[model samples]
Target: RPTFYRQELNKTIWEVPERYQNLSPVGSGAYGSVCAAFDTKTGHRVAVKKLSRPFQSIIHAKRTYRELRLLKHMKHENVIGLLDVFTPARSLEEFNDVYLVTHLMGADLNNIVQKLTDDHVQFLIYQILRGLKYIHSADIIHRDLKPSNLAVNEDCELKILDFGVATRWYRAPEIMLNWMHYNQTVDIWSVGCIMAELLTGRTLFPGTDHIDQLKLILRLVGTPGAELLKKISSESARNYIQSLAQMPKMNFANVFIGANPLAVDLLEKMLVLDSDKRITAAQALAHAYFAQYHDPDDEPVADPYDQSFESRDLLIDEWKSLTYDEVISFVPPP
Candidate 1:
């Protein structure tokens, strides 16, 4: 690591600002390290996530830029805010570290979701969909939406977190089969999986392998219709699905058992096999499952996803030129 200094109440970090104290690192990952720290300015605990080697390579630079730009612009209560981004390295030559400052959450949805009452489940899921509503509007598939990344607290509030995972496991049928293209429905699949887990305190499809996972999904929901199957260009996987012993299409009620029909109805629409047939978050929020709590007049302004990622890799010369041109773009708070 580059030699540096950052001193807090009783701690010293090489590149982090010194004001924050009680720095307890949560864990390290592909990007960098995260920790819970005491913010001297805010007089409370907050999360400090450091992005390691943000601009180290072509792939690294683009991913770093995307996350920073997206978080900087996207603002929603249901979505976590990017309070600040900064670096301690003095010169552009040494500018590799990036830190994200965000409000610390009490716990994750995984821990408190089961403890919630049926009544609480609706509102929490409402926020999740609402959060996703904006994300999808931006044409961004969350790719990852497991319980661990969803934040929760005593008040039963919910917010989506972690946007950088490139792979998909909460993936849709099209994603798994490697269709020519897919859309926001990819995230809806993950939502269906999450909703099922919340309702029954179990994973809807907990397959150990990708093929096994698809099998589990087929076992529960049955194989897709020929029309939907024909949409799949992968003949091998298509035949595999078609060859399955015509499993009976199961309803959410059959799986969630005691769940309300309206709630099951929403789940069924979300988990539909055809991407075109799957219900959007906006439509989902309007479903009768949330009729008691949602009001049309108070509906969120639809912000459709109209953005896309950059198309090419920038070599160091191109990267540095553009990188320097974009200086002062992410200045962190004190």
Candidate 2:
């Protein structure tokens, strides 16, 4: 095979490595486009994400490096594994774009979310919590957790993808309110949102903007308690929250309508407004909702990932060299 597969996609030439063949576009976003292909070397289907203009700016370079490092560090059955990374560039000066290779599932969660039964939802959520447990133990918060980011296979297996920040609708309230010291509780709130979406097949809190998003959150969660109110550092946001009419928290059963009782119970624990009171990934796995599927032996944890690079502000070339080093050092799994 040739060393590279040069093809035009969305008006741009994508020079992906030749190991990935029969590339077909699957999804695209602001950062890049994803294609499903047959990995000739591994003899398996995988998703190849081409990062567009990865070195366009300092912020873009930082994010590109961050995602690559995070994926390389994470290894779990319910988390997307990095199969390979490549670029057509032969030297640092030519390194402007990159391709990330990951295991390819049949479809993302959104494609099949409406067809899931309660049992399907249960298994999927359990896997998410299981993976989240591993991720949290590493001190990595998967800030973005939504149906679109969750890849699923024909057998109803699910895995969390995209360790990037957040989707506006699924973002945690504390994050939107700008809490300086928010922790993993933010991810729990997202899980709670995904659970509700799974139950209803609807977007939970489809707000038009940040202001409306906060309002939507408060409506269901109710106005924050005075003690919780003081925690919000944004003066305008805090004042705006106090000005709204008090809304009593809505009952989960009523909102989810005919959902499993245990599921509803778990939802209540996760969707709490107070970040301090929100259930953790570890605790959520232990809840009754997951009792049948939760096996202590099967649920694995990881040591903390070294994210020291995140604090450094490096030039484009520096980030480029570091990223290239990561790509060069990658050893594909059998």
Best by lDDT: 2
lDDT values, one for every candidate? 0.71, 0.83
Local error of candidate 2 at residue 105 (angstroms): 1.9
Please provide TM-scores, in order, for all candidate models, with all chains considered together. Answer: 0.86, 0.91
Candidate 1, poorest ten consecutive residues by summed lDDT: 1-10
Model 1 TM-score is 0.86
Give RMSD to native, each candidate. 3.9, 2.4
Clashing pairs in 1: 7-18, 137-304, 137-305, 138-305, 139-305
Predicted candidate 2, C-alpha RMSD: 2.4
List the candidate 1 regions with Cα displacement exceeding 4 Å: 1-13, 27-32, 163-169, 296-309, 317-327, 331-334
In TM-score terms, candidate 2 sits at: 0.91
**lDDT per residue as tens, model 1, 257-313:** 888787788888988888899998888888888877676655454355323447765
Runs in model 2 deviating more than 4 A are 28-31, 163-166
Q: What digit string (tens of lDDT, one per residue) describes model 2 on residues 211-308?
A: 78888888888899988987877887777888898899998788888889998999899999999999999999889888779998889998679999
